[PDB]
Amino acid sequence: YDLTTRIAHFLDRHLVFPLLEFLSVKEIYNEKELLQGKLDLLSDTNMVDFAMDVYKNLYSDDIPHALREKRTTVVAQLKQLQAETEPIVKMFEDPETTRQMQSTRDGRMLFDYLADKHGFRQEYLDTLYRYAKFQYECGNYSGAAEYLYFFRVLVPATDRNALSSLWGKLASEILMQNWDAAMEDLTRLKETIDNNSVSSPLQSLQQRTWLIHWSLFVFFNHPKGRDNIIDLFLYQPQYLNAIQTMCPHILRYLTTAVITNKDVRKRRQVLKDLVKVIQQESYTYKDPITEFVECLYVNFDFDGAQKKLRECESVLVNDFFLVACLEDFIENARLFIFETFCRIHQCISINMLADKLNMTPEEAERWIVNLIRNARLDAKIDSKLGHVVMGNNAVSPYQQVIEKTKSLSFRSQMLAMNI
Amino acid sequence: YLHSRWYQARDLMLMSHLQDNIQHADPPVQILYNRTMVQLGICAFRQGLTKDAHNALLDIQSSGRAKELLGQGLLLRSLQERNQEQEKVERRRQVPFHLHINLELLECVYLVSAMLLEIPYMAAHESDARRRMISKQFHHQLRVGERQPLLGPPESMREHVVAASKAMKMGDWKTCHSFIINEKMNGKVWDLFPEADKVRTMLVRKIQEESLRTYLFTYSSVYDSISMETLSDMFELDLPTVHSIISKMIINEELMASLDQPTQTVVMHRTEPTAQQNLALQLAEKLGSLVENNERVFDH
Amino acid sequence: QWLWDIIDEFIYQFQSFSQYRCKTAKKSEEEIDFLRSNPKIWNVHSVLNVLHSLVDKSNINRQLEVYTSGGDPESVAGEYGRHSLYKMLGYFSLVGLLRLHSLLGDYYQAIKVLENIELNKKSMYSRVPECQVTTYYYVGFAYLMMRRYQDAIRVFANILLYIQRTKSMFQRTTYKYEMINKQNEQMHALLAIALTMYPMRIDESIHLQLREKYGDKMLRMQKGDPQVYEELFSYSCPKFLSPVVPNYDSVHPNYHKEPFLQQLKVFSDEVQQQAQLSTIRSFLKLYTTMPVAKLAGFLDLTEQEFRIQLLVFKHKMKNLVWTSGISALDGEFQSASEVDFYIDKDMIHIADTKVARRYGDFFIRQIHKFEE
Amino acid sequence: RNTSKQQQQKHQYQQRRQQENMQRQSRGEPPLPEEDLSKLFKPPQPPARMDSLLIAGQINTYCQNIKEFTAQNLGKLFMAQALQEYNN
């Protein structure tokens, strides 16, 4: 990877406006926590994904974070400080902060439709200038961004504000928990990272991580947007060689849509590059739940693999995100590791298939009835023993070399007979 | 690589991209660059990675430059090293003896690492099925030690390789260990690392797993039922290794082989050794169709 | 203009050449012996039986597309231009067969095929491989319209292989060669899907590139996809009633569409039932003797919900392809598992490579003949 | 075939680039030589057919087919006789 020479001296020194913190001393499910925090560096005060830490277990420590983000949904952050009933008594700032915003919004809501009804390229941009100010004063006000960044988008600060207000609008619509106006800013982020900038990695790997955040929580077709989140930027999945490869769960939604939403042919491209080499190896050293997906599969295990999937599948479902590819990756971990066993093998006891993958034998029997009908396992089924015989071994492969030495050489010598 | 873990050293070579900066920046730093990728291959060998011991010795051991990459080549060593005054420049410059390194280790790094690789690889080739015969390889570094009918006891560093190579070709893992481990303690080559006990133990299994393959590659036509209980006891290899062996013996080598891992049984039935000559003629006549096509490719 | 006058320029030349061979092929062996002796090229007066007939196959339905109902030209074609060539004494060379190939060329365009019991019976002249390719081309459609595709699968493999050894060398086809290559591709892809798993006969004529493509189509039409049958019909729908080519696609006449609808409505009513037939047989007969629970294992797979599970399976047993049986005392569905063989495709090409030696030995000694 | 490739590495694979060097220079200067025009088209080492190796190549590979036709028939006459004389 080429931009690593910029990373070779910098080594993961990102630049965000909401800086660090994630929800001190914890009890349960700890591999998600730094994972949540290193993205909460880069994802600008989520808005439910603070309380996504809280859905596994309640803490009083979700309070000190979004209290100090009074731009975003002012009154609900007034409610969170009293949700712990804390005398923080300086909450007299957000009503001071909103009052300048109301004088800037409604003082220019007059101008907001002078921007539209005139469409005067000064007076639009004159309104847009004070709303370049105001949508960076508050972009939360994301509907005030949504009216703003639907017309001629480019504010009089086309690079710093028009990113951080549109990434702000990508944040703040998701911070208002909108997704279609975030699908506006899906496109407005994925092109702004594509222009891009000066493209320092401290900007770029942040902007690469900015791609990861909205695509992490699936609402709409991120099973198509997995290809947007793999096959962009020289398709490293973590986008950060940058030894803390912390765009971390991306393999799971990637190998979701391979096995679920695609076929698995085309999972060989996943196992070779997107599992092994450097970045996912780092995330193999980060989450053991993704590890038993891959490391017992790369051992081609048949009993330890299927159950340590199934044990980690009980923790794959513990991905308490807005997820929408949760049991897809879980079920098609079973369905592909059975495809892993019966790929090359000789037989299986249906009673063993029942007891290994914890099903009943008729469920085990009728599943190869489906696996012939899907033509994923081409075999026969012994109807009465409960022993699917799968004996694919070929004899005399000669006829194919023979076919292509006499369809070519016999028929290209035909062509030399016209002179 | 040395003072930390070599996963970083693999990355930072890929990171800083020092394939190009070394040229303009004082090619005695290319000597330090060639010192570095040697020490990459050292910590390829310290981490036991045999391919990277071959591939970090790619800018080094694809050439006889490695003598002069410590600045110690001789003038009449070839018809190239001229002259004494430039030899005075290079050897007033290079190099201190503690900055010299063991090239006999480096050859035993370079030869043995592909010895456990290329011999099951060529045992696929020498089973009357070859299409990937790679020229200019350890195969050719074997050729200088190969055609030696007089060769008695292994005493030289290549002789310990070539003896262990024949022990590797027999499929017996134990016989390689006599030829390598004791003799690199005899030549103090094993006696160089503190990690060398692990490096030996890493290369214990690289001999055990791969001579198991040459056991299967050479005795392939008549093996039509292959155990997994016996081979777990024979080559002293546990089942999750053996399942990682035998599946990759079936999947990656693409041998026609039925497998019942609940029964722990490999069933192969290759069929046939007289039709290996039919494969040997399809080695010949497929070349017949290609240059016939290439007869028209150049001419048109 | 530039078409319709040249249509009439061709047809008047055609119906005249329908007359010159109707008169001088019955009692005369006089102009025939004049035609054997003084012109040494045997080609040209056997070209005219194919050159003037193939473009007559064009120009007749060219007017019949406009003259849809109450149409002239097929009566001008068959009864006066083709049947005058059909029922005569033979020009004892490659004319007398190709007059029947002129007739069966429009007796295939007319969908009225029954006389294929007759067209090969009066064809007791030597079946030259020039005519043998056009024999198994035309005759195999009647087997394709016989709904016995296990016999039709072998006929279309012959004409698609093109190792049926034709070599002429005076533009004899004429001017249209890969259309025959592409139509028999679609006619054998029609026969590839319809019977599989039993062929295993898609290997010689259809090469491995189209074995993968149409074979993946062969899976999907049997696994359920109607897009393959839509590909199988719409690529083949002019290929049952093509003139060679229509006139000119326009918006203003309703005329051209009216035999275009006649090409659509005929051959969709046949093969769509065969598309359902390919779905009924589609499942592999995994085991010969099913118990009732594994009968209900396949009654599930035949058609469930719910009602009419046994009787729908009874409909799906009785499609000539499920020879089966209920043991009503035992509760033992006793059926077939018909399977086939592969390896024997080295006995045909053992002489073809003995030809591929000899065919290489032939022309290069013919080059050696021109440099002797 | 290594003869057949190397000759076609010289018959045309040289002359594809030999004329490419020659046609580029507008095939000569009017007032002067035509210096490189004389220099270009230097003939390659096989220019034509290599028909000394090729003739006994045509012999000895035909001699291989005699050994084939030996190995073909000697195969048959036992594959007859074993299928013959076992079959009772």
Could you characterize what this model shows?
This is part of a larger assembly, with chains A (419 residues), B (300 residues), C (372 residues) and D (88 residues). By secondary structure, chain A is an all-alpha fold. Chain A has 23 helices and 2 strands. In chain B, 58% of the residues lie in helices and 3% in strands. Chain B is built from 13 helices and 3 strands. In chain B, strands 1-3-2 form a 3-stranded antiparallel β-sheet. In chain B, strand 2 (258-260) and strand 3 (265-267) form a beta hairpin. The longest helix of chain B has 24 residues, at 276-299. Chain C has a 3-stranded antiparallel β-sheet. In chain C, a hairpin with a 4-residue loop joins strand 2 (326-327) and strand 3 (332-334). In chain C, helix 3 packs antiparallel against helix 4 and helix 6 (129-144) runs antiparallel to helix 7 (149-161). Chain D is built from 4 helices and no strands. Chains in contact: A-B, A-C, B-D. The A-C interface holds A 365-366, 369, 372-373, 375, 380-384, 395-396, 398-400, 402-404, 406-407, 409-410, 413, 416-417 and C 207-208, 219, 223, 283-284, 286-287, 289-291, 294, 297, 300-301, 343, 345-346, 349, 352-353, 356, 359-360, 363. It is classed as ribosome. The entry lists the keywords Translation initiation, 48S complex, capped mRNA, initiation factor 4B, start codon recognition, ribosome. Human cap-dependent 48S pre-initiation complex. Chain A is Eukaryotic translation initiation factor 3 subunit E.
Compact summary:
This is part of a larger assembly, with chains A (419 residues), B (300 residues), C (372 residues) and D (88 residues). By secondary structure, chain A is mainly α. Chain A has 23 helices and two strands.
Summarize the topology:
This is part of a larger assembly, with chains A (419 residues), B (300 residues), C (372 residues) and D (88 residues).
Chain A: H1 4-10, H2 31-42, H3 52-56, H4 63-66, H5 74-83, H6 94-118, H7 123-137, H8 143-146, H9 161-164, H10 166-175, H11 180-195, H12 201-216, H13 222-230, H14 250-259, H15 268-276, H16 279-284, H17 288-294, H18 304-316, H19 327-341, E1 347-349, H20 350-356, H21 361-373, E2 387-389, H22 399-406, H23 409-415
Antiparallel strand pairs in A: 1-2
Helix pairs in contact in A: 6-7, 10-11, 11-12, 12-13, 13-14, 14-19, 17-18, 18-19, 20-21
Chain B: H1 6-16, H2 21-24, H3 28-46, H4 50-55, H5 84-93, H6 103-125, H7 138-146, H8 157-169, H9 173-186, H10 196-218, E1 225-227, H11 229-234, H12 239-250, E2 258-260, E3 265-267, H13 276-299
Helix pairs in contact in B: 6-7, 6-8, 6-10, 8-9, 9-10
Chain C: H1 4-23, H2 31-37, H3 44-66, H4 73-86, H5 96-109, H6 129-144, H7 149-161, H8 178-193, H9 208-223, H10 226-234, H11 257-280, E1 289-291, H12 292-302, H13 309-317, E2 326-327, E3 332-334, H14 349-369
Antiparallel strand pairs in C: 1-3, 2-3
Helix pairs in contact in C: 1-3, 1-4, 3-4, 3-5, 4-5, 5-6, 6-7, 7-8, 9-10
